Amino acid sequence: FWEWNVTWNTSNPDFTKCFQNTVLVWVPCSYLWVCFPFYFLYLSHHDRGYIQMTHLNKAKTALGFLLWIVCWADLFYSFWELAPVFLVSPTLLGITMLLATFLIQIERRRGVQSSGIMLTFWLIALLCALAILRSKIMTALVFRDVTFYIYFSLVLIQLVLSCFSDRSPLFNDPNPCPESSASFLSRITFWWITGMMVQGYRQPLESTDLWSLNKEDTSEQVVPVLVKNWKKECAKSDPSLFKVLYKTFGPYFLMSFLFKAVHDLMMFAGPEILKLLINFVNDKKAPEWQGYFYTALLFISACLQTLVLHQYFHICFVSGMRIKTAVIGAVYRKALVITNAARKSSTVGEIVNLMSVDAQRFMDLATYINMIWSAPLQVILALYLLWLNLGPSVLAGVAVMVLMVPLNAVMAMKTKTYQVAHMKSKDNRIKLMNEILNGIKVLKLYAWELAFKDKVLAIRQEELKVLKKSAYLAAVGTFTWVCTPFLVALSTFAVYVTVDENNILDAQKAFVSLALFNILRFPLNILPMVISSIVQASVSLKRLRVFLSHEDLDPDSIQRRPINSITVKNATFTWARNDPPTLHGITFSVPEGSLVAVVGQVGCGKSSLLSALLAEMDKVEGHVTVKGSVAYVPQQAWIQNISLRENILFGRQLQERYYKAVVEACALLPDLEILPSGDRTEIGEKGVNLSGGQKQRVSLARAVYCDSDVYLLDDPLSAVDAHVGKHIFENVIGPKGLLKNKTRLLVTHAISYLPQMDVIIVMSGGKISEMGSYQELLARDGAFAEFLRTYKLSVYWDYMKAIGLFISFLSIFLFLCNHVASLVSNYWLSLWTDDPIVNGTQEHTQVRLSVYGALGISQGITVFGYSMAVSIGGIFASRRLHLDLLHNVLRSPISFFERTPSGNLVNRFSKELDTVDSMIPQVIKMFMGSLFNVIGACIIILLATPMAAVIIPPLGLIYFFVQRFYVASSRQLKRLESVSRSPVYSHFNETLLGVSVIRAFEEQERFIRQSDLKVDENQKAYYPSIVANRWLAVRLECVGNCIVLFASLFAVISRHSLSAGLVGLSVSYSLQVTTYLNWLVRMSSEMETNIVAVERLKEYSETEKEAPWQIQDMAPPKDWPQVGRVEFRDYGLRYDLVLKHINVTIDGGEKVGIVGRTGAGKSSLTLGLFRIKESAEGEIIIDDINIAKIGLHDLRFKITIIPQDPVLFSGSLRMNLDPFSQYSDEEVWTSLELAHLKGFVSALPDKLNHECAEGGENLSVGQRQLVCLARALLRKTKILVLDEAETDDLIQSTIRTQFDDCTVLTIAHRLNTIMDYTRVIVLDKGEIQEWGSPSDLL
């Protein structure tokens, strides 16, 4: 059969009769025969119960019975009587049909709602039947034909039935995951998530809307299998973790291999069909059927490749997710089991980090593993195809691609070093900014704001130098990326043309190799990432192996007996296998309900005893028989971040009477009162911090509530005061407390409660010297006596304006020029490939190469240009935005700083500014590039085929809807996952810190179950994110495949009016457009969530600012305060009025103080002098000039203040005294000498340039106060204000020494100093209670 006359070269293409009856029937039957055996593996290993008896299942089974009969009815007619094929073809078909009906039967038995096999098999059978059908209907325009019609109709109905999903098996999961219930088609197309996609677009997702996890992804089903496998390997054996990993999750992972192979083959199938189409358009006088025949082949191959690839994505990521979950669980269990000796050597941060990155590396590696063979083979295969196409010249074409792999790497590593440089400078600035943010009070008072702004600008210049260098380096980074396509094309084509003149450049020889270069880009660029990830995963394997192999505790140490209470005979314990025994000879019997105080010389082994009783020490010998539950009060109190109530409860049923008897018996009532929410307050490191004594009380309260029979109290009363300790012992530990019948064993170094103890076990270097009772031990006069004797589109326009209109417009124009250069390069290639051959060589071949080179060189330069433009633009915008934000912040009044959430300014200056200067330019570059790559593909499709504008509207609508839904619903899922990630590591830190208490109470099961919930919660948000990426993927590749199909169809329909090169270029760009579309959506999502930073940086633009610092119309004279005559004329300060009815007059050079209680307007009065808060009603005038009219800086410079706590800023002492450096060195020296500081200031090796740290931590409080006094003295102003809280004698004498000439206001909380100052003003509630000298006061 297979004669090309009727199958290939004919107007009516009909498969031959033999071919119809043999191969078209062997294909489907054969598919089920090879899959059937393999399918039992899945059907057996994976079970979900059995589906009930439904009409659908039966309908399918009955049609399977009838179909088999019909096919065997053919054998009956063939038997009735010639051709051998008229017997076997139907018989085999009947047998495979009997396998099909048996398969739906067993699939019902094994719980299968929809079958992919029973769907692909029917699809293949349908296509084969369709081919025979068309042939049989063309043969007759009766005997065995009618049997085939019946067969085809039954097969079609069977295929339609196989699409519907059956009922769920009878054998809660509120809001579950539709993955386990969706039909084969929905799983293939990932439609089941579109629900959340639409819902997320309308109702912003929360933690409870997220679907539950399928049973296999729950940590409760993936940790026990890994634990069992690791136990089996450990018991069998240097145990290897990799063998465990690929034995536990490898079988599910191996299905990725098939998908990867099919995807590679289907990816390569594209260029071959492209070559066939280019041949077809060049081959005139050829049937249209061959051209349309292929346009279908391209479409089907592209769609199938898209579907298979994402299954692989899903499969790998599922395996990686499972890997992460199982590693997390095993690490948690190991950490709860391992020995203290093996645990101390490894750092706590080492272990939390082992779960923070090492565990996740493997989860990520899942997407860089298969490439280990996909990337080489692809490349190799591609190279071979390229070698088949052009020749050895293509080696030169790729010689530059392999040259870009190291170069690009060298680029990234360098900018990493700049990343290190920039970051460093940024740290310094934020540090400086932090000092301004917490010290804005002092700056405004001295008007030193501009001086600090200058230092901020200097640090910013330092940061922008590195930013400029990184900017220039980035420009070549994009240049090479965009130039690569042209570079490889020009290099290979110029070499091909120049090497030999007989080499003809045809459309197939130029565009097929051009597309092969595109499918070579990826496998050649991911290899370094794959290798780096594999090496990091290998070091993670080593780290996890050495951790999971750690030594462990053995329950044999203590023989706990369910409730002579504590029994130890000849027991020696160690803290390590090789270290000497901490306790050599331990032998004691503690009876039930007895109080035993282990007492001894610090460094004896008291805490070791309790640790041993808890099986924390390593028992080298002996016998310990602790009887009943043990409640441990550790020396170092472990506090859970949960509320104080749940700290005391410790996962136990709340009993109001017992809880309320425990809380005050520990004297926790005052602590409950001071704490904000009472016992519901969030204690711990993260929440409210607690004093050591409060932590010990909480630990003791938790132990007392747990109601154990044996208590091990390792110094519970170390941090509680003597009265609190005695009260606690009276109501808790004493014989008349809460634990009267409980076997208490306490470690103490305090004698006060010793006589009340039943037995006192004194030790010595880990050896009991005497074991008796207080009175008996005292009578014996031995070791115990010795012890006792011991003692929004507008934000984009705002960002463009920040860059500047000129730079943005120039960048857009140059980037359009790049676009046109690339397009005309492609058009020139198309025109070049169409030249005829005369005398065995192209008519023109040198001028075409020259124009190609010129076009490409123009492309490269403008790419390097516009990239540099946005780099300069980005840096310009960063400078302008920082300057504007700094001006707005510093110009704002204090009320803004007080009222704003203190902390949202810091991340604005650090995180959002970092977002602006670095991420925004890169994102705008790549988004703009992707957008115009898509537009170029569209225009080169529409230009080459004018009548293709009917497909743009629907596909654009599909793209717009998909992009809208994805961006909206994915930037929220990412936030949910990010939020959910942290609690796992926080809980691990808590467990690591409290493991001894966790094991002592034997509540490790509860905390194991808790770590289940948090990891499951994180997975519940991570899984929808990857499925969201898959949903994007399938929708966008469907759009791209439709583009390819329509481009090829509209090129084939107009073969006469088109040339080979034009069709080739159209198809190559249409093939490329899918990746550009995907990255365009991904980049648009990146830009939407990135540009908002500018919006939050444009804040405080209109925020009410202070009065102008310099008016310059009503500026005062140089000697503004000639005498300093202050007059508060009906002053009222809004804050309802803290200051009210203030009519006072302080004469020039008259000492005046302000006295008043808390809540008066004493301090607010100073804020009136410096205009910190605008006067609600008042006319303060100094001498003959109003303050409100004067600019702020002027008055703030002519009046000085010595505040409550002097703020010393980082830098030299001279910059502290004179930030402007306006005063000469002699003045600074004189002021420092007059401030009783000459002796100290001369002592520093740096002279005046002593580098004081943040807040002057190196300097003492007295020194900082004297430095502030030195600042005030150096100012030399007639009006000075003092704010009083050892060195008081010195500062008081100094303010009384030379400032007698100047007018001094004084607000002191101490009456002793104010008595010296005449004219005291007393403020009761803002009113002037008394106005006169202290002599008139008394």
Ligand SMILES: Nc1ncnc2c1ncn2[C@@H]1O[C@@H]2CO[P@](=O)(S)O[C@@H]3[C@H](O)[C@@H](CO[P@](=O)(S)O[C@H]2[C@H]1O)O[C@H]3n1cnc2c(N)ncnc21
């Ligand atoms: N199935 C597949 N087959 C072939 N290649 C595939 C592929 N899937 C993915 N890609 C990749 O998609 C990108 C296609 O490029 P674009 O679509 S033209 O744009 C990129 C992209 O937007 C993003 C990163 O994309 P990226 O992952 S780095 O890698 C390439 C390409 O390798 O940033 C842009 N971009 C990349 N490099 C630069 C640069 N130096 N300067 C500015 N913008 C850059």
